Amino acid sequence: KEFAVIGLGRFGGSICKALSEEGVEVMAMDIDEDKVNEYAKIASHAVIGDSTDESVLKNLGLRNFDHVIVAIGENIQASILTTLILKELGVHTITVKAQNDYHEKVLSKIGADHIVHPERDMAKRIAHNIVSNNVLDYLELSEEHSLVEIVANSRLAGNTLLDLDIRAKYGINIVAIKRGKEVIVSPLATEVIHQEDILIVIGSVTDISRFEKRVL
Amino acid sequence: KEFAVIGLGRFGGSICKALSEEGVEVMAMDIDEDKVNEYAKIASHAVIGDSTDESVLKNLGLRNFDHVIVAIGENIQASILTTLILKELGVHTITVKAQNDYHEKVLSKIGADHIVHPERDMAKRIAHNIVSNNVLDYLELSEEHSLVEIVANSRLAGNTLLDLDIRAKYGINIVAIKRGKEVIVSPLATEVIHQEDILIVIGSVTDISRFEKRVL
Numbered sequence: 001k002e003f004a005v006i007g008l009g010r011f012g013g014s015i016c017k018a019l020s021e022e023g024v025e026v027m028a029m030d031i032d033e034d035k036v037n038e039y040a041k042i043a044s045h046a047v048i049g050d051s052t053d054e055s056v057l058k059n060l061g062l063r064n065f066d067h068v069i070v071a072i073g074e075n076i077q078a079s080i081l082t083t084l085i086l087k088e089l090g091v092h093t094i095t096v097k098a099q100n101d102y103h104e105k106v107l108s109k110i111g112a113d114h115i116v117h118p119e120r121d122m123a124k125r126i127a128h129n130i131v132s133n134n135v136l137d138y139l140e141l142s143e144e145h146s147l148v149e150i151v152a153n154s155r156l157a158g159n160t161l162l163d164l165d166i167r168a169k170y171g172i173n174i175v176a177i178k179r180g181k182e183v184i185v186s187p188l189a190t191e192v193i194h195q196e197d198i199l200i201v202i203g204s205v206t207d208i209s210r211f212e213k214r215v216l
Numbered sequence: 217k218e219f220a221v222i223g224l225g226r227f228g229g230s231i232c233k234a235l236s237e238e239g240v241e242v243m244a245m246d247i248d249e250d251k252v253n254e255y256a257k258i259a260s261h262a263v264i265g266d267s268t269d270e271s272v273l274k275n276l277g278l279r280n281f282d283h284v285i286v287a288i289g290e291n292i293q294a295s296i297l298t299t300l301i302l303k304e305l306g307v308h309t310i311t312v313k314a315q316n317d318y319h320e321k322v323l324s325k326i327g328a329d330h331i332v333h334p335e336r337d338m339a340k341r342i343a344h345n346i347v348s349n350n351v352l353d354y355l356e357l358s359e360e361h362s363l364v365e366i367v368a369n370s371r372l373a374g375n376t377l378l379d380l381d382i383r384a385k386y387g388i389n390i391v392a393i394k395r396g397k398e399v400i401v402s403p404l405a406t407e408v409i410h411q412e413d414i415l416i417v418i419g420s421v422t423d424i425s426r427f428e429k430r431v432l
């Protein structure tokens with residue numbers, strides 16, 4: 001498989017490092033020579049170039065590449081134009097970092113396959129933690145369902161899962177518990193909740209909200 | 217509770233918007249007046265100022281604030297100095313966006329409570345997906361354990377969980393299945409895996425790796 005990353009900022013450079021650490025080859029490109037130099041021994045092919053020169057991406061051989069990541073940030077126009085060119089070159093999968101909603105909307109119509117929002121998505125998790133302290137983190141599983149990490153409080157602590165009856169009363173499922181350094185997976189109803197346990201829970205976002213209100 | 221965000225880039229501004237959307241008050245600060253203007257109706261108090269002026273943060277009343285987020289990016293020195301000042305002001309919880317390892321190392325010793333890497337953390341998830349296609353995403357639960365989203369292949373499809381015997385053979389647990397738009401939570405052993413099911417799995421990173429090798 002052939003991988004390329006265009007734009008070596010914190011996202012693009014981290015993609016380059018992660019791919020390198022996974023043990024695969026990656027072409028890493030940036031218009032800034034100093035950035036390219038930083039990745040000269042990390043990427044298998046580090047390239048100084050402007051990705052908005054059509055012949056440049058073609059001459060580099062990006063036609064039919066398996067996956068190209070566009071991580072140009074503040075230059076929304078360069079990002080969009082680069083994406084356009086990659087699509088015309090038949091790149092199978094194009095992932096692009098979006099700067100805003102406008103950027104995303106355009107990227108979607110010109111055929112980016114995956115549009116990602118690293119800063120925004122982490123900000124949302126952090127803000128949710130901030131405003132509800134017992135909720136440590138969450139991961140959306142579908143439009144309706146999420147996984148949520150919940151710190152047990154005094155009300156939960158000391159009771160068996162059987163007695164808590166959370167599935168029947170709240171519609172949500174405790175699928176694991178982090179207890180100290182250990183993770184208890186698929187705990188039985190006989191499991192007793194300890195103070196400072198982190199409950200790993202799956203349910204609808206609606207049911208989770210009701211649980212937070214009732215219990216947290 | 218009192219919240220402040222310092223630096224309104226994509227991360228800081230997204231934190232400001234997310235907090236605003238959660239319905240809480242937030243003070244949003246930036247040295248760039250145009251950025252502050254963008255958040256004047258989103259933040260409950262939008263402030264033009266240099267967070268590295270000690271008297272500025274004190275006069276704004278940040279002493280003993282519940283949570284302050286430092287999202288100054290490229291100015292590592294301003295970030296570090298701002299963090300130092302907030303700590304001296306007794307801020308209960310300081311979360312800081314780190315630009316690199318050096319930045320993180322210094323932030324840790326001068327007492328940032330939470331150091332976050334939005335670009336890097338998303339890059340790692342993406343790169344892992346890229347190099348192992350059946351693996352859609354993952355979330356670390358502990359140093360030893362992770363949650364992983366795995367697309368079922370032809371080998372898994374058509375078999376009951378009972379017959380697959382994945383817990384006994386691989387040490388990992390299927391705690392949910394995304395099937396179309398639905399999530400099946402805590403499936404029973406009688407559940408049959410469908411093509412294109414997304415298995416939500418929890419196990420040790422070691423056991424997960426062995427499973428990927430054997431089955432994916």
Ligand SMILES: Nc1ncnc2c1ncn2[C@@H]1O[C@H](COP(=O)(O)OP(=O)(O)OP(=O)(O)O)[C@@H](O)[C@H]1O
Pocket residue numbers: 006007008009010011012029030031032035049050051052071072073074075078335
């Ligand atoms: N036309 C182009 N061709 C190749 N690289 C480019 C082009 N335009 C910009 N870049 C590179 O893209 C990289 C990332 O751009 P920038 O730093 O503005 O994005 P960012 O959103 O701050 O990135 P991150 O959030 O990942 O740090 C920069 O190193 C820049 O040199």
Ligand SMILES: Nc1ncnc2c1ncn2[C@@H]1O[C@H](COP(=O)(O)OP(=O)(O)OP(=O)(O)O)[C@@H](O)[C@H]1O
Pocket residue numbers: 119222223224225226227228245246247248251265266267268287288289290291294
């Ligand atoms: N001393 C300071 N006081 C207040 N705000 C500052 C200070 N220095 C920088 N900022 C603001 O911090 C914001 C973010 O900085 P910058 O854009 O360099 O970070 P970034 O890593 O690109 O952010 P993001 O990744 O969140 O887009 C900018 O709006 C900038 O004006």
Ligand SMILES: [Ca+2]
Pocket residue numbers: 076077080
């Ligand atoms: Ca444009």
Ligand SMILES: [Ca+2]
Pocket residue numbers: 010119226335
């Ligand atoms: Ca960024």
Ligand SMILES: [Ca+2]
Pocket residue numbers: 292293296
């Ligand atoms: Ca420094």
